[PDB]
Every structure is written in C-alpha cells, then in structure tokens.
Ligand binder design. Sequence first.
Ligand SMILES: Nc1nc2c(ncn2[C@@H]2O[C@H](COP(=O)(O)OP(=O)(O)OP(=O)(O)O)[C@@H](O)[C@H]2O)c(=O)[nH]1
Ligand SMILES: Nc1nc2c(ncn2[C@@H]2O[C@H](COP(=O)(O)OP(=O)(O)OP(=O)(O)O)[C@@H](O)[C@H]2O)c(=O)[nH]1
Ligand SMILES: [Mg+2]
Ligand SMILES: [Mg+2]
Lengths: 178, 415, 180, 180, 18
Amino acid sequence: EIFELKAELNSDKKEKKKEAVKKVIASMTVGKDVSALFPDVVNCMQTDNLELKKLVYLYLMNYAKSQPDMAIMAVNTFVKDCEDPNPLIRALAVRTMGCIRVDKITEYLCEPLRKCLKDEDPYVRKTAAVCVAKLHDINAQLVEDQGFLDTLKDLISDSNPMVVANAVAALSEIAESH
Amino acid sequence: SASAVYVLDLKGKVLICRNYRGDVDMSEVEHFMPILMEKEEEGMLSPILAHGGVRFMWIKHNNLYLVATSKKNACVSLVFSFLYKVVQVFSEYFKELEEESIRDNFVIIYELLDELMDFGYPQTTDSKILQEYITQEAPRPPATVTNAVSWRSEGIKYRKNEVFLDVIEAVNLLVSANGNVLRSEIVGSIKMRVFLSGMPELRLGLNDKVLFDNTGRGKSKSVELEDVKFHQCVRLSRFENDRTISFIPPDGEFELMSYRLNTHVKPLIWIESVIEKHSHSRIEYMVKAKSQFKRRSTANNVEIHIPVPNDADSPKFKTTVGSVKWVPENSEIVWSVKSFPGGKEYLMRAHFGLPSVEAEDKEGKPPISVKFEIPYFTTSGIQVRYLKIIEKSGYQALPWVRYITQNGDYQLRTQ
Amino acid sequence: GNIFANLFKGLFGKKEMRILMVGLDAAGKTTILYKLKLGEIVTTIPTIGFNVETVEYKNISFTVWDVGGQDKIRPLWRHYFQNTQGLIFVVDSNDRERVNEAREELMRMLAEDELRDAVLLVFANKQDLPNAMNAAEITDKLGLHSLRHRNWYIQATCATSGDGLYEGLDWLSNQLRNQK
Amino acid sequence: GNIFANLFKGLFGKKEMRILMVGLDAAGKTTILYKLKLGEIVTTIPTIGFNVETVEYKNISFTVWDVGGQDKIRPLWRHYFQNTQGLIFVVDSNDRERVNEAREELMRMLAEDELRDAVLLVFANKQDLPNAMNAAEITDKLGLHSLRHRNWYIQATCATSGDGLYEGLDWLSNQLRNQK
Amino acid sequence: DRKGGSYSQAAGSDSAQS
Ligand SMILES: Nc1nc2c(ncn2[C@@H]2O[C@H](COP(=O)(O)OP(=O)(O)OP(=O)(O)O)[C@@H](O)[C@H]2O)c(=O)[nH]1
Ligand SMILES: Nc1nc2c(ncn2[C@@H]2O[C@H](COP(=O)(O)OP(=O)(O)OP(=O)(O)O)[C@@H](O)[C@H]2O)c(=O)[nH]1
Ligand SMILES: [Mg+2]
Ligand SMILES: [Mg+2]
C-alpha cells in the first residue's frame, strides 16, 4: 500500500507515476492523510506533463502547512517554472506560490512576483495580481517592502480589462485590511 | 470573500474541497452537518450558516449542498453567484449532477475548481471558453478570456449560418381562493441557439412599446416589458442610449434577453372547482375548466393538478375530456389533457372515499396548478422585427425563431 | 476564337473591380480601410504617402488605394487617376471650416476629363459626434445633384461602429456590376 | 522464459545508467550541467533547490541530478541517495577555506552504508584560475587513495573551456559498463 | 415539425424605419 505507492512514485516510468499521482490525489480526497508521503512526491516534481504537475502543486498546497520543513525543497522548482514560455504553466506556478502557506518560502518568491508583475500575458498579469494580494494578506510587511503597491496602482491604468479588474480587486482587498 | 469552497454529500461526506484563502480550518466542515440538522429541526435552517466566526453560506444541489466557508464579511451575493456559475459549469461538463460523477471526474474537477477561482475571486466562468483550456480527455489559454469578447470564441467556422430562437412565455397567475387573481405576471424568455461562422454582431430589433414611441410608431401592438434583462454579450450602453440591442451571439444555446411585464388580460384557462367533501364520509370534485385562450391555439399537454385528500382512497373520476389519474406520491388528482383546443370546456365530477377516523394533524390546502403549454401563441403580443447579423467576411444568415406559450406560476388558491 | 475559359471563370466568379480611397487628412480614410480589410479600428499616423489594399467580398477583389489629404499630397491624386476604375470620397462633417475645402477639392478632382468612368462615392465619415449632419444636408451643401452624368451615392459610416459599410459595398457592387 | 526482446534491444543499445551532481554552491555544478546537456555556459542563480537533467551519449542516457551546496541543503543529499546508481563530486580548488568543508562533506556522504555501489567521481572544477592545483595535489589533500573499496577517478574540467568533459564521460562509462 | 410552435424565420431590421 504505502510502500507500494512509494515504490511506484520512485519509478522512472511516467505511466506508473501518473497512476500513483492519481491514487495519492484520490486518497487525500477520499479522506486519507497522505502528508507523510509529501517528501516522496517531492522528487517527482519537475515533470514535462502538465497533468501530473497540477496534481503535485495541489498536493503541495494542501500539504504545505502540515510539513513546512519538507516544503523547503520546492523553491528551485517554482523559480524554474516561473519562466516557462507557456502562460498557463506560469499562471499555475504563480497561483501555487501564493497558495503555499510557508513563512520561510514567501521571502524567496519576491523576485518571481516582481518578474511576473510586468508580464505581457493577461492571464499572467491576473495571476501576478492575485499573488501580490495573497502575499500581502500573508505578509503585509514583506509586500510593503517589495514595493508592489506602485505596480498595483499602475495595473489599473494598463490594458487587459480583466487584468485591470483583478488588480483593482486585489488593491481593494489590501486596502480593506489596511 | 469565501475562504474554502467544498462539495458535500447527502450523508455529510465532503465529496471535494478546495480552499482558496485558507483562513478557515478544514475541520470546521464537521460541524456544518449538525448545524444544518439543528436549523432544519428547529426551523432555523437557512442557506447561510454560521459556525462561530466562520459562516457556511451554500445552496443545495441535486445530490449535494455546495458549502463554501468564509470568515470575513464577504459578499454573500458574490458567493451565491459563484456557486451558481460552478453549478452551471458542472452541468455543462457533466450531463448529470450526482455523486457518480464527483468520484469519477476528479481529475478535471480539481483543475476546473483551481482555474475558476483564485484567492476567493473568480476570474473565468464561460463553459464554452473553459472547455478549450481544461479537458478530461494543455495548450495556451485562448485569447477570448484575455480579450474583451469573452463570450464569442474567434475562428469558429460552420458550413451553414443558422440561428434558432425560442420565445418562451411563462404564464404565472396567483389566483386567490376568493376567485380573484393577485399575482398575474408574464416573463418573456428569449433563448437563442446561435450556430454561425465567425463572430457576428447581432442587431436585435423587436416591437417594443418604448422603441415605437421613440421612433413615433407608438400606435400598433407594442410590448410593454417592465423589466428587460440583457445577456453579457448585449451592450448595456447601446440599450441605454436608443434601445439598440447590439451584441455578439455566442456559439451554442444561451439566453440573450429576459422580458418581464405584468399581465392585465383574462386568464387563458379558467377553472371552476367545487369541493363536496362530506365529514369523513365522501368527497365531491365538481371541477370545470374553461379555456379563455384563442380558439386557434391548442394547449398541448394540459396538466391541471387538483390536490385530492391525502388519506383519500378508492377514488372515482367522472370527467369529460382528458386522462384523470390520482398519484399517491403527489396526493392529488392529475387532470392530464393531451390536446386542449382553445375555448374548450372540460367538466369533471370527482368521488373518493375517506377513513372514518379523523387525521391526527391538519395537512393544509395545496393550490391547484395547471400545466398548460400552448405553442405558437404569443400572449404578450411582442413580435420580433429584425435581427441584424453582420460579419466582417460577409455571409447570408438564415435566422429562425419560435414562440412557445406555457404556464409558469399559474397556481389556483384552494378554498 | 473560343471563350470557353472565360465562361468557365465567370461561372464561379471572375470580376474583381477596383476602388479608390480619397479624402482629407484625419478623415477616417486609414481607419475605414483598416476596418474594411481587417475589421478593427487600427490607429495610424497621418498618411504621409498612400495606402494600397484589396477587399475580397461578393467574389470581387475590391482593390482600395487610400490617399491622404495633405496640402502637398492633394495635387498628387492625379497619379492615381491613371488605370483607375472607381472613386470613393470620404466627407468630414466634423470640420465646418474644412467642408468648403473638401468640396472645392472634390470639384477640382471631378473636373478632369480622364476621370469620367469613375462613379461618385460619397462616404459620410465621422458619424459619431452630434455635430454630424444628416445624409441630405451634406449632399445639399456639396450639391451632389448638380454633377451631370455622375452616378453618386451618399452613405454614412461610423468609424467607431462600422455600420453602413455593407450597404456602401453593395451599392458600389450594384453600380459597377450590371448583372444578376 | 524468453529473452529475445532483451537481446534485440541490447543489439542496438539498451543501457542508460544514472548519475548524480553534488558539490558546494558556486562550484560550477549548474554551469557544468548546462554545458553537458546544452553545450553553453548558462549563467544561473544559486541552486536553492535542485536540477534534474539527462545526457544522451554513447547510447546511454546519463540522468544527472544537480544538488547545491547550501548549508540547509547539505543534509538534503540523503534524499537523492535512494534509487541512485552514480555519484559525481565537483571540487572547488579556488576556495582554500572551503576545501576542508568540501572534504568533510564528501567524507560524511561517503560514510553511508546505503551509498556503496556509487563509484567516486571527482571533478576538478574551476580550472581557469592560476590558483587551481594539479590533479594530484587536490587528491592528496582529500586522500582519495584512502577510500577502501571505492573506484574514484580525478578529472579536471574548465568551466569556461569544457576540456576533459569527454574524458570524464568516457571514464564513467567504462566504470559503469563492463562490456565491449 | 417541433412541439411548442414551429420555428419561423426572422428579419434583419426594421425596413419601415429606415
Ligand atoms: N474617435 C473617432 N475618431 C475618428 C472617427 N472617424 C474619424 N476619426 C478621426 O480620423 C482619423 C483617421 O485617420 P487615419 O485612420 O490614420 O486615416 P485618414 O483619415 O486618411 O487620416 P490621414 O492618414 O491623416 O490622411 C483618426 O485620427 C480620428 O481622429 C470616429 O468615428 N471616431
Ligand atoms: N568565470 C568562471 N566562473 C566559474 C567557473 N567555474 C565555476 N565558476 C563559478 O561557479 C558558479 C557556478 O554556479 P552554477 O552554474 O549556477 O551552479 P553551482 O556551481 O552548483 O552553483 P549553485 O547553484 O550556487 O549551487 C558560477 O557562478 C561561477 O562564478 C569558470 O570556469 N569560470
Ligand atoms: Mg490615413
Ligand atoms: Mg547550480
């Protein structure tokens, strides 16, 4: 069971890796505490297939507060994924970075947020606008130090009406707690 | 500002959960079921719950109640709108709303939940547009979501350009037991199934009373629609300026506009029912239905629901036209008529038994509801004038539209 | 000789036709051409030179040669009068002081004996401000009815909206083509 | 049983093998991996996490898992010791003060009973400054000859140039593969 | 045919209103 799942996840075959990821997702959704296998799934993180990457990101987000120490092995992966040419991959990485409830992980994510703040992709712009608000809610001092308020203010005065609306909502949420 | 949107089951098991802000612990869902049971058992059950400092505002679906946790003073209306959009998306993706698909389509369900709402703020809700980015059987997101037109995907090509319209009428009548109708409102429903090539900009034109008055033709039959609810594709500014209905139709079936005006005309069906219920001996149902609608129109599938006694047994029906069946599950006499010509008069004489022993508690008087649906009948008299289908390439469209008249909240108060 | 190839080509559509794009600077000529060709309001700098494009509609390739309204480019319209079959004039109703200049330029261009087969094509441009006149006040001011042996047609098109472009194209096709 | 499919696969090449990438931070590990995979000196930020790549050479897919030399990431190398077949250590001869730390880390990693089949792979990194020692002074300081039952091979590679990478790959292939 | 009223073709605009 657990040993078999770990062996399957530590295999070099993508066909078994996908099945193991699906089984792990089902066990967590079925009500199984799969947080003990978070470090095992950490090795199988950088994958070309987008289907397994989403499941891994969801497991990390749902298994971030439980094992914050074991989450220290994902900053490099997030940094690498923050520059993917596909806008969807970058948006997913930005969403996962802001969803990670780690105090020692948000500090190193300031650079990717700054890089994605001026993203040309409207989906990337919206993802960065959401991530900035999430970081401010998690850490107001870090957000203020990063100087994201100026970028958010100029976001409303840019193109992409959906991105402008998202930036306005993030600014309202930040000012609501301000 | 929902903290975590979760999907429960009929036994209290959470089918799926997806936290968006994490401000509420996932263990608070355990008290949701007992709280709902206490509210229902004490009459305090409401769609918005409250577990201490966290509120559980959600609605009940076909098989599960979508409970979305929240902690701050989030917009309850926004939460309800997000829940409705999620239900519509699930219905579009999954033909059935039951636990059979929740445990079978988790791979796509999780992706849809993650993409739909981020940090409690939904961003994408178009099922047709969303079907091009998340599939259950990933390329870059389509430019429609980023572009202003998020309801008309570009590049759509069809062999023909046919748009099917559906002017669905809802005759709602609130007739009191004294014989007077209190709530008599008719709500128009313009549902169109646009299937063309490209992204045409429809120019809707009808015989509105306001438009006729503005143009100076306020002398013919003009629809006085009190409320007009345009769709997302319809430009609000164009309608506000000079009643210009200009919008880009989408690919598929969608609701463009929803008229709603009061009705001051005679009812299409007049029901004269009598209750000769003896005191624990017998009961009589002298029900007479008079069709006040036009004789040229036929009400297909007329279903006048007559609430019979709950404990009544051994019933006999003496009617004139239409199949009369008593459903023990519904506890009422179903006056089912296949075709009802306009001006027809159906007379019924019911006779059912009753136990000698009186019931322990009263059961109330359910209202009599008619299920008449007469197609090709426009009670409001509103007629479509024109539909300006304009495309950059240039093509000859073949628009189509049909008028269907049915009964909405057409219930008759019992005596 | 045999004309079987010509008949076969005409069975599926062979005629293309031509068109001209003239008018004052900032008169919506470049925006109108972009909308006709692409279908979007493209913002462009003033036409220092000229713009040449083609429009495919109704099986006819309507080649359009946009011409600016610069003072140094006003007398350069005679270069496009050679091998030209159509002529479309875009009016600027938002410039009361420039209306007289536009009318004088149209009269000067219409006073050429080489440009005789080009029918008149009046376009009511800038149909977005309340100061714009109707489809007859501008024609009455310009005296389009006084053009003997000239087939003119007044069409109002809104640059922001694009309404009436299809009607103008249909009228131009009906004037150029004398078949079913 | 039948092993015809295995023989057919081996006739054209079936073995791939694995490899590890360990060493101190700023030791040329990321640059070395980029040169091995791509062939260019790619400038990268310090490896906060880890880098996983594969190298296709001599019909063997040499999968390389780069590991940084961070203090908090030094004890995280035990995660990569599971399902690991190779191990390559990159020395930093330009850091005299860090040489002792690197030797201690190598001794600590080599003192694990699970990592026994992984042969030693010493890479002479930073072979571009005059302060770099020879291929024996570093080995003598590290005492690579004192590793009983360990097959170690010292190879000097210049990050700017890339010389000696082919020799190191050939030595690794000869150590891993015991066939013609 | 179709229950609820046969579909009818729709016009393009109010030709009588110019
Ligand atoms: N906002 C707006 N501007 C219009 C409209 N119609 C015309 N214009 C003006 O007309 C100008 C159109 O210029 P272009 O599209 O570059 O082509 P043009 O009319 O030949 O102008 P030139 O290049 O200078 O000759 C724009 O700069 C607008 O200011 C309209 O409907 N809305
Ligand atoms: N100019 C130059 N720098 C070298 C050379 N060899 C190693 N370096 C240094 O080594 C560093 C290599 O870092 P990376 O390529 O990112 O990988 P790394 O060695 O594992 O460093 P970390 O990521 O911090 O663990 C560079 O920043 C260089 O400063 C060399 O031959 N020439
Ligand atoms: Mg121009
Ligand atoms: Mg590195």
